[model samples]
Target: SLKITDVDVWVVNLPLVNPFGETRTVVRVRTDSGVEGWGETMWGAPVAAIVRRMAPDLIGTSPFALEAFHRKQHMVPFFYGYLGYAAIAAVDVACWDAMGKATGQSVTDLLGGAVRDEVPITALITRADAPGATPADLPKAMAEHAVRVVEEGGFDAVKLKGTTDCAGDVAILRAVREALPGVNLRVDPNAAWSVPDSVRAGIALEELDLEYLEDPCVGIEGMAQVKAKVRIPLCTNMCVVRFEDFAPAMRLNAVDVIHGDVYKWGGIAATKALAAHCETFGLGMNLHSGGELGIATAAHLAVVSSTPVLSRAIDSMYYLHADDIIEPLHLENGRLRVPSGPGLGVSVDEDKLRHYAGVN
Candidate 1:
């Protein structure tokens, strides 16, 4: 029956190419048949505790009984909260990885099949604060980062993080647009603006030819207001976070593109389900990162490679880690090739894992 035997949780602190370091909660599930599957989530110690608390319910179940396990986990009162979902995400991803290994297929092959060999990825250019620059330098600093991502990093697309100053945001977007005339550019304010401010900024920035303006304001109502005012397509990860959020957002005709992350959306199964929903509603699907490690990146790439409606380049910030527990997912011309090996197609580097474990 391939009953689950253990759920081991650990934290690994991986150095980053960027100034801000990253930490991930790694979940490794072992089955009675000795098969092991791995998954990771953003945040650290607390999520690991959640995984530990949920371990007993999974210990004796069939590893392939994913839906049943998921339902059981959700049935527990107060178990479907945000961090709780992140815990479920790790477990769900581990189960899928285990299933892929048991069946001798790649995770993508198991999900459906590959629709493309490689998935286009977008590089994130952070706000000026990342480099310890003053407010006056933000515009040039952000534009320079965008130029580096496209010119040196080989990305065809870039996403800029918005600043507290909307004027600077517009200036940065303008400079980036001028620098990369043909490249796809997008901006995410992370819901930092007021509804009126979002409208004004969206109107002003419309001339730059952005691919879309993401999460300009908070909530479905706010996004709807921005959508009403802008020529650019509106997108979100903030408003439509869960399955339930979708109907309300769609009802408002709020978002032009829907962003899904394995952790935030539950897991690969839930994420793919969302992609199908996006396809049905004629909304574009884009995969995002929740500070994932290589395992999550590999898992995401597998799904992104096969998701038909996900034509946009996905967030590939996993590549920003200076060291990883698995073989580094090197970007080739700014695209991630779907790994062809069984399961998640990557194995953990025990020495690296142990080193990070000590520091974490």
Candidate 2:
């Protein structure tokens, strides 16, 4: 029957090449037939606890019964809320991995098939704050960083984390546009601006030929208000997270694009369903990262490469880690080649996993 025999959870804190370290909750589902699968989620400690608590419900179930288990957990009143969804995501991915391995196929193949061989990815240029850094100096810092990410990092696209100051955001975008005329650019203020401020900034940024403005304001109402005035397309990850939130955002005419992650927007199946919905609505889709490791990144790439409506370059920051638990994904000329094997298409380095697991 290929029933699940056990579920193992590990919280590993891995060092990064950059300043901030990375933490991931890795899940392993073992079947009665001696097959195993891997999955990961964003936060380590709490997610591990949630998985531990939910482990009993998953044990003895068929690995292919992902929806049945998912619905069972979701129907529990007040059980599978925001954090609970993250737990379900890890388990769901692990189940899918198991299914792929059992069938001797890849996750992409299991999801029908892939449309492209290599998927383009964007490099993130977050707020670069330093000692005694002022708002006036931010434009130069941001512009310089943007130049490095495109010119040196070999990325064709960049997403800038804009400042609260509208004029400063405009200056930064203009400088980057002048620096890299051919590169695709997008800016996200992370809902730090008011509707009026976002509209004003959007109007100025349109001159620079931006790809889109992401989450410029807080909610659907705020986004709708800004969209009413701005020439640039509005995208969001904040407002439309749950399944129920999608219709309201659509009804309000809030956004032109959706930035979703397997972790937050449910697992691979739910994310695929969301992509199908986006295609029906004629909206663009982009896969957002949740500080994923190799396995989750591979799963994301496989799905995005196969999805026709998700045209924007997805985010892949796995290389930022000093040593990944699995084989590092290949990134060349800003495009990530989708992994080509069964399941997540990567093997975990048990030695590194043990080292990180021991430390934290």
Candidate 3:
């Protein structure tokens, strides 16, 4: 019965050790009862304004009215089913946080309780090859760099982002496999290859025995072309971006795995529902990372904690983050302990939030 009173948006720039940029946009949902909850997105720029504009709808609504809010937004002013979903995601997550706070429960408890105390996590290794290494030096260079990152963090799995050169993509994973023979290894070209090229890479990678290949090519049909030709499983965070993008992929057998995210798919509730769909179809599901600060990471951990179908190490760039707006999340031995406190289990520091605030 809590009434929402205000919805505010903020943008902050934080440092990361990885090559990624630093802008993150978040929303604060204020209720009539003096309790507030937070949400965030992986993107900013034009979307931050959208969050402000959409706040009017949330201002008078209940934080527990998640589905109604989600539906009313898209139906009210045309379609928020695309980029607008990111705005919806941030707010919906905040509502869940608010709901959890009001009920004195963790978001994990609200989401059918934690399936596991800690969830498996995978590191996002952007650059594995050593500097000054020639194409011929790629194998050992990539292999050695990945091994060190794994050993340093006690990681059992790693995702190597690709160079888009399909030939070299195959070689690098081969090198990584030679080095960390039993580690769960995956490669993400992020839809850089053409149908023929992805097929070639997938065929070449068959001998290396990767855990999966993430977005080797582009479209649903495009990936289906490669998947049908290769023995290795093909997964995507690229092709099937939304609920509508899903049906065609499943019908075409375009993906063996789905890398779902809270940001792109709407929110914690929507993404958790996505896990059920993936499991129903006998497809694998893995959580996606958004280069998140602690707030979004806590939200992700909540969803991941309750979703039992996710058997893979969830994606994360948290290890690369130099600082965050909330307390540091525990990450070690290739697992992240689910936050156990009520309403996300982490509180934002006003000092850090103000220090990092930049976009407007």
Candidate 4:
């Protein structure tokens, strides 16, 4: 039996690319036999603390006793069903890491092995607050960015975020389509448009031959309606907060793509479940990448999935950080490689982790 040793938090600062702001979070986990397993649930400051508090439950328990450890610590109800997904996710990730070390295999390898050799990548271009930024300039910015991605960053596709007004949205899509003919483009309204407004916008975009339209409507039901109205594929994110929601959405054919945030949708375990669900429904699994810890989890998902799989392309342009534990995942000549090393295939820099240690 391995006794739990240490738990801590590291704040990874992601350089600009996200629309919201800096991507910082607290990470917590336990170790045994001088081997460390890591987990991240930086939903916020509070969630990190919660994860930290739960670390003791792992002490004196067998490090490889993944399921039992999770169930015992998770079922403690005084904490509002600590068995809930978020808390479980943090522990699960660390467990996976521990298992990987124990077996000398990568997370993807442990998760039924890699079905795809490389992970496809897409760039997320911001259409907000540029010089003379307006609905008119949206298309040009997208076009220029698309060129940069292909020419400079080597990304194959681009996801554009824009305001949701009907006329402005239509014109922006038109301009981008006209400017970057044949480029794979995905439009994400980011729940900025209402159902009716999305319907109107979708009606126009359906004719433009887009790769996909992500999260046009504000909610799941609205998303279904918009999907019904549009000819282009509909990709959704926020509403996919849980796995239970994913099956229903897929059964209803409500969304063509599902965005699973490893950190938000729990962790590696939930992500694997979501990916399997997407494969079953023929829906695209566009794994979300907001929090900084997305590097390890998302890469594993991409490695395990099949090529030309739904949601195969990842929006990782923003999640790049100065101090990523592994090598910086770069899109070379418009393609990204999923490292095939043992256990998520990347090494963590302990010095860097200490540099950003948040709770210490």
How would you encode candidate 1's per-residue C-alpha lDDT over 1-360 as one tens digit per residue? Answer: 899999988888988875227888888999988899999887888888888988988988887898898787774326547788888888888888898899898999998899888888888887743476676776777777777767776777889888666777888888789878899999988889889888888999988888889988899998998898789988898899988788988899899998989888778888899988988998987987777778988889888887888777887786676778888775678888888888888898777777887889
Q: After superposition, how far is residue 28 of candidate 3 from its true place, in Å?
A: 0.7
* lDDT by residue for model 4 (1-360), tens: 665677665555443443223434444345566666665554455555566677766666765776676557544333543224555666667667766766777777777665666666677666552446655676576566556655676666767776746677677667766766767888887888888888877888877888788887777788888888778888877766776576667656688877776666555666777777777777777766655454444344443453335345676543444445445664456555665555555566767656555422
Q: Which clashing pairs does model 3 show?
A: none
Residues 1-360, candidate 3: write the lDDT tens digits: 689999988888888785224888888899998889998886676668788888887778889998788787765223555457777888988888898899999999999987788877786665544767788987778788888878877776898888778787778888889889899999988888888888887888898788898888889999989889998878888889888788888889998999889888877878988999988999998977867778888998888888888767888887787778888889867788889888998888877787788523
Which numbered prediction scores highest in lDDT against the true structure? 1
**Cα-based TM-score, every candidate:** 0.95, 0.95, 0.95, 0.84
Alpha-carbon shift of residue 250 in model 4 (angstroms): 4.2
Q: What is the descending TM-score order?
A: 3, 2, 1, 4
10 residues in a row with least lDDT, candidate 4: 14-23
Ranking by lDDT: 1, 2, 3, 4
Off by over 4 Å in 2: 18-20, 75-80, 129-134
By lDDT, is 2 or 3 better?
Answer: 2
Candidate 3 local Cα displacement, residue 71, angstroms: 0.5
Clashes of each: 0, 0, 0, 6
**Candidate 2 C-alpha lDDT tens digits along 1-360:** 999999999999877674228888889999999889998887888888989998998889999998798788875315656667788888889998899899999999998798987888888876663334477776777777777767766777888877687687788788778888888899988899988889888888888878889999999999999988998978888988878889998898999999878988669988999998888888888987778878788889888877887777886676576677898888777788889889878888888888888878
- Model 1 gets an lDDT of 0.84
Model 1 misplaced regions, further than 4 Å = 75-80, 129-137
lDDT of 4: 0.63
